[PDB]
Design a protein around this ligand. Structure first.
Ligand SMILES: O=c1ccn([C@@H]2O[C@H](COP(=O)(O)OP(=O)(O)O[C@H]3O[C@H](CO)[C@@H](O)[C@H](O)[C@H]3F)[C@@H](O)[C@H]2O)c(=O)[nH]1
Ligand SMILES: Oc1ccc(/C=C/c2cc(O)cc(O)c2)cc1
Length: 440
């Protein structure tokens, strides 16, 4: 069986999507997968749980530790230097796999582009698995031209960027590493983007119906850009441990529950949690809120008790796909991470977008002004979203006209998602087309 080698950037939001692509490759086709994981530290309990739960066709190997004493900032820079200081270990690992097996492809994420020429030299075609939007991919291919054209900090550009086929995008909403052009994170992002051109091909976790403009543009605007393969949505099945969540959702009316979840990495002040609480309470709507610390002793006096009839508080973790696919679930207050967004898209659940970091501000603008499947609260001057504003937008989503229009549009995207991933769907077919070229 041909071997595919996958090199994830260190960190769980890099590993989980590439593990998901791995599960897809080995279920749908006759391939084995070897994950080579560069690491700043010894395996986590979280990494070992995820990795030891995979089918036997997916092996894994933590590479020799890069000494964290010999890395003197932003996570983009740390990721990049981990890849660089692991180049030798990967070349060595890759050399040995290549002689003991037929290595037909290398797959990396958007920070593994240092491996592309290494893979080419060894007769292995390298692919980029882009875990965010086609719009975000287009933004990044355009960034070097933007960097020359515009000399001010992007937030100071009073006019929006209008990429062909895409919603206008103010500079304040550009990805995080583009918000300080003096930080090294900006320079590393440009270096990696400049090498996307070295990929045999770029998989994108999206589909034609979701982003027709950015995909049309990516696939026609430039010969310089490699082939681009929309093969999504690819999402976790959610058939794993856990949780009174489902028992509780069963007692609620159809489309009546607002699921509220900022991810693992999405951190809110105690002041902002307490405004969210009062806001949920005074909305009058039913909610399931994954409450992460700023058990519920820091929450507004009396709140836990006053919402016993209409809201469930869950510490730390909920079964997201099980919640989102339940008929009680009417909405999702999310930080707009792409994997959460895709889960919500395939289950027809419309959103309130509350972006926190990475490319989330760009996802919010796409979801809110482009696809019109999301509402958005307004922050006050200091950046705090006030209880009264949370209540207003919760009511708009769960019972208002804007919510009805969003729910309708999101149910249409839901139907496209099901179609494009079915036996004869555009996404199933395209990935089969690319994989079959490896099979020989
Ligand atoms: O209580 C919980 C909370 C989450 N989950 C699951 O964790 C995943 C969350 O993915 P999400 O894209 O929202 O966050 P993250 O992993 O940081 O994504 C990064 O990478 C993304 C691109 O790959 C990027 O768009 C994003 O901004 C980054 F953060 C998703 O599979 C949920 O079902 C859960 O099961 N229970
Ligand atoms: O620890 C980290 C975990 C995840 C990330 C992701 C960064 C990122 C930046 C982009 O411009 C686009 C994108 O899709 C992702 C960065 C650090």
């Amino acid at each position: 069986a041909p071997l595919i080698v996958i090199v994830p950037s260190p960190g769980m939001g890099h590993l989980i999507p590439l593990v998901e692509f791995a599960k897809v490759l080995v279920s749908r086709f006759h391939f084995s997968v070897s994950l080579l994981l560069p690491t700043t530290a010894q395996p986590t309990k979280a990494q070992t749980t995820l990795l030891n739960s995979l089918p036997s066709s997916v092996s894994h190997n933590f590479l020799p530790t890069v000494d964290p004493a010999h890395l003197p900032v932003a996570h983009e820079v740390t990721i990049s230097l981990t890849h660089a200081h692991s180049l030798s270990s990967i070349r060595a690992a890759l050399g040995s796999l290549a002689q003991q097996a037929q290595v037909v492809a290398l797959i990396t994420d958007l920070f593994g582009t240092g491996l592309y020429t290494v893979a080419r030299d060894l007769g292995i075609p390298p692919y980029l698995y882009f875990t965010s939007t086609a719009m975000c991919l287009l933004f990044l291919f355009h960034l070097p031209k933007l960097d020359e054209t515009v000399s001010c900090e992007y937030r100071d550009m009073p006019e929006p960027l209008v990429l062909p086929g895409c919603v206008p995008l103010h500079g304040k909403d550009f990805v995080d590493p583009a918000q300080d052009r003096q930080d090294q994170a900006y320079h590393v992002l440009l270096d990696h983007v400049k090498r996307y051109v070295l990929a045999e091909g770029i998989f994108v976790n999206t589909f034609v119906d979701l982003e027709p403009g950015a995909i049309k543009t990516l696939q026609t605007e430039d010969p310089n850009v490699p082939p681009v393969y929309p093969v999504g949505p690819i999402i976790q099945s959610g058939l794993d441990d856990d949780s009174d969540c489902l028992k509780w959702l069963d007692r609620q009316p159809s489309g009546s529950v607002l699921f509220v979840s900022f991810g693992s990495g999405g951190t809110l002040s105690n002041e902002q949690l307490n405004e969210l609480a009062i806001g949920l309470e005074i909305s009058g709507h039913r909610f399931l809120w994954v409450v992460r610390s700023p058990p519920f002793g820091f929450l507004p006096t009396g709140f836990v008790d006053r919402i016993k009839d209409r809201g469930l508080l869950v510490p730390s973790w909920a079964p997201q796909i099980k919640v989102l696919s339940h008929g009680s679930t009417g909405g999702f207050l999310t930080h707009c991470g792409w994997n959460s967004t895709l889960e919500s898209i395939v289950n027809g659940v419309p959103l309130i977008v509350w972006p926190l970091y990475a490319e989330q501000r760009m996802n919010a603008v796409m979801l809110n002004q482009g696809l019109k499947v999301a509402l958005r609260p307004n922050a006050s001057q200091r950046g705090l979203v006030e209880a009264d504003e949370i209540a207003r937008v919760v009511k708009e989503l769960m019972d208002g006209d804007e919510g009805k229009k969003a729910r309708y549009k999101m149910r249409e995207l839901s139907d496209s998602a099901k179609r494009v991933t079915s036996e004869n769907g555009e996404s199933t077919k395209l990935l089969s087309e690319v994989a079959s070229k490896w099979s020989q």
